[PDB]
Amino acid sequence: KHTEYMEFLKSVPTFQSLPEEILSKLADVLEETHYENGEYIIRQGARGDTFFIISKGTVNVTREDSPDPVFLRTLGKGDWFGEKALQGEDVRTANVIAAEAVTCLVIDRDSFKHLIGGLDDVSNKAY
Ligand SMILES: Nc1nc2c(ncn2[C@@H]2O[C@@H]3COP(=O)(O)O[C@H]3[C@H]2O)c(=O)[nH]1
Ligand code: NA
């Protein structure tokens, strides 16, 4: 699966410019987690320490605005989420629910901070 992960990581726009050794270290520390259509992956308001990369399926992002949660957007394979709880405060700013059978590759804070955190595309991420 290490080779499987590495060729997947090389296909994502955000991670293909990273030295191969860093991609190798990521593929060794990530965890594969699976969800079913409608399952909550992330709940707004919880405190989190994990970043997610979608390797299969799609998810729906909703968020209770200041003014009922509002449908925000859909993310699919190759997309990633969960970076906000990893920048500054550790609170999740939105819900992310599985929209079908989903597989996510999960990286914890310890790994994110050393391997992914200094990436322009993710730190300079604006919605
Ligand atoms: N707050 C917010 N999060 C979004 C949006 N679109 C996708 N997300 C993801 O939803 C995630 C919820 O967990 P995080 O707040 O850690 O990180 C968030 C983002 O990666 C959006 O328009 N607003
Ligand atoms: Na934050």
Curated annotation (Swiss-Prot):
Tissue-specific expression: Primarily expressed in lung and placenta.
Localization in the cell: Cytoplasm
UniProt binding sites for 3',5'-cyclic AMP 2: 82-85, 92-93, 127
Domains (record comment): Composed of an N-terminal leucine-zipper domain followed by an autoinhibitory domain, which mediate homodimer formation and inhibit kinase activity, respectively. Next, two cGMP-binding domains are followed by the catalytic domain at the C-terminus. Binding of cGMP to cGMP-binding domains results in a conformational change that activates kinase activity by removing the autoinhibitory domain from the catalytic cleft leaving the catalytic domain free to phosphorylate downstream substrates.
Note: The 3D structures in complex with cGMP and cAMP describe the hydrogen bonding interactions that modulate high selectivity for cGMP in the CNB-B domain, and reveal that all these contacts are disrupted in the structure with cAMP, explaining the low affinity of the enzyme for cAMP and the fact that cAMP can only weakly activate PKG.
Oligomeric form and interacting partners: Isoform alpha: parallel homodimer or heterodimer and also heterotetramer. Interacts directly with PPP1R12A. Non-covalent dimer of dimer of PRKG1-PRKG1 and PPP1R12A-PPP1R12A. This interaction targets PRKG1 to stress fibers to mediate smooth muscle cell relaxation and vasodilation in responses to rises in cGMP. Isoform beta: antiparallel homodimer. Part of cGMP kinase signaling complex at least composed of ACTA2/alpha-actin, CNN1/calponin H1, PLN/phospholamban, PRKG1 and ITPR1. Interacts with IRAG1. Forms a stable complex with ITPR1, IRAG1, and isoform beta of PRKG1.
Family in the record: Belongs to the protein kinase superfamily. AGC Ser/Thr protein kinase family. cGMP subfamily.
Role: Serine/threonine protein kinase that acts as a key mediator of the nitric oxide (NO)/cGMP signaling pathway. GMP binding activates PRKG1, which phosphorylates serines and threonines on many cellular proteins. Numerous protein targets for PRKG1 phosphorylation are implicated in modulating cellular calcium, but the contribution of each of these targets may vary substantially among cell types.
Name of the protein this chain belongs to: cGMP-dependent protein kinase 1
Native species: Homo sapiens
Span within the parent record: 208 to 336 of 671
